């Protein structure tokens, strides 16, 4: 049973018009196969610019964040319809930064993802646990509660999980001084697909994509691809460098 | 003690690319004097596009929000550096929608204005109280507090107030169509300028631009402008309508 390899690029709060132009062009030129999905998430101010630079059939732009309200009195916010009007398919939801740093609740992350999913978008729905929580031993407790909020919000319409790519962020290895082992990452991915099968759809638990946003590198990734329940990567800082193309290359070979 | 009149328009989380082009060009095609400061805030997604539609030499584009950190791991967050790279001089800060709905603290809003102010942006700082607060009679107290948090962050560099525009938006007034009588609108501006001379500076107070926000509209706008301490308007709903251009004519004539 094969799921489709999927790699995301998260630029976060990085870039200028020129860097978008030069970087997007860089990735676009890299030969991208059709067995693989490649997405990059530029900052909102750069969506229009990145999209002009994308001369690629294969690659597509995503957005880092969106709101749980349609167009309205929501200053400082983007809506799904603004995204779709610009021709965007993918958006990132639940990133650790917005959850952990910016006070974004599981409900807001789940409410946000559902809304987008209703309208046909693919959501990179991001979940992960911090070191305190790993140490508590609630690795599963924390991730599943993040996931369960999505199950609850999607609810009856479980068709929507189809457009969800799970992103596991090993937040506890982000300069905690602790790095992840491919074993530890895989163990989590197995544990999550187990939840989805057991509590959503056993049939569709083999079709969902779960990617490892966990300090994946040019190396230590050829290993990570090998992990069977790891379906690809959500790169962060490295998505701003040419290392990113190489990471793409690995996914294909693996 | 003459203040240069300032009218700002907030699209809020509204717009389509096509809409943005057409409207921005309808505004640019309007005769704007060198006497009045005009600024419009489209969504971050539409910033590039709005700047391209803008053929005016007086009109400026603004941002409805900015983050309090710089470039880096703030997924879903825009930075002043991104803004200035795009050629933006104005950003909106401390809007009741984000304050009263999304949980932006007073200091969160204060640290955003300061950082954007340090890098020489002209900040549209928003203050305002809820229907309750006004009834509890806590108007000046609330407006002062939101205003104080900026003082605290600014601290020694008090001149960063020079490029501050203050928008008092009654919380009750906004959207509910119910609005502030000129007697009322003016009442608040005196207290706020009272605060500024009192707490900040007595020469700079003469020059700080306090603009009135909320349900501003034709006919009504007219007396509102005549109020000698109301230096302009922050428009939401009508900024989207051809009405906005009319509003600028009134502001100047006044």
Numbering used by the authors:
A (entry chain O), B (entry chain P): 2 to 255
From the study:
C222N and C222D respectively exhibited a catalytic efficiency 10-fold and 17-fold lower than that of WT GlTIM, indicating that electrostatic factors in the region of C222 are central in the expression of catalytic activity of GlTIM. The most severe changes in the Ki values were when negatively and positively charged residues were introduced; for the C222D mutant, an 83-fold increase in the Ki was observed. On the other hand, the C222DC mutant produced triclinic crystals with a P1 symmetry that contains 10 dimers per asymmetric unit. WTC and C222NC produced high-resolution structures (1.6Å and 1.45Å, respectively), whereas C222DC was solved at a resolution of 2.7Å. The C222DC structure had an empty active site, which is consistent with the binding data that indicate the low affinity of C222D for 2-PG. The crystal structure of C222DC provided a clear atomic description of the structural changes induced by modification of C222 that explain the observed detrimental effects on GlTIM. In this structure, it is relevant that the 20 monomers of the asymmetric unit display structural variations in two specific and localized regions of the protein. The structural alignment of all monomers showed that loop 6 (residues 175 to 182) and loop 7 (residues 214 to 221) exhibit a clear heterogeneity of conformational states, which is evidenced in the per residue α-carbon RMSD values of all chains. In regard to loop 7 it is important to highlight that even though slight conformational changes in this loop had been previously noted in response to ligand binding, the relatively large conformational differences of loop 7 in the C222DC structure has not been previously observed; its main chain atoms move as far as 2.7 Å from their original position. Therefore, it is reasonable to assume that the introduction of a negatively charged side chain in the low dielectric environment of this hydrophobic pocket is a thermodynamically unfavorable process that destabilizes the entire loop 7, and alters the structure of the critical YGGS motif.
TIM is a ubiquitous glycolytic enzyme whose active site and overall α8/β8 barrel domain structure are highly conserved; even so, structural differences in its interface region have been used to achieve specific inhibition of enzymes in parasites. Since Giardia lacks oxidative phosphorylation and depends on glycolysis as its major ATP source, it has been proposed that disrupting this pathway could hinder the survival of the parasite; therefore, glycolytic enzymes have been considered potential pharmacological targets. Our results indicated that derivatization of C222, a non-interfacial residue located near the surface of the protein and 10-15 Å away from the active site, specifically inactivates the enzyme. C222 is at the end of loop 7, with its lateral chain positioned in a hydrophobic pocket formed mainly by carbon atoms of residues N218, G219, E223, F234, M248, and I251.
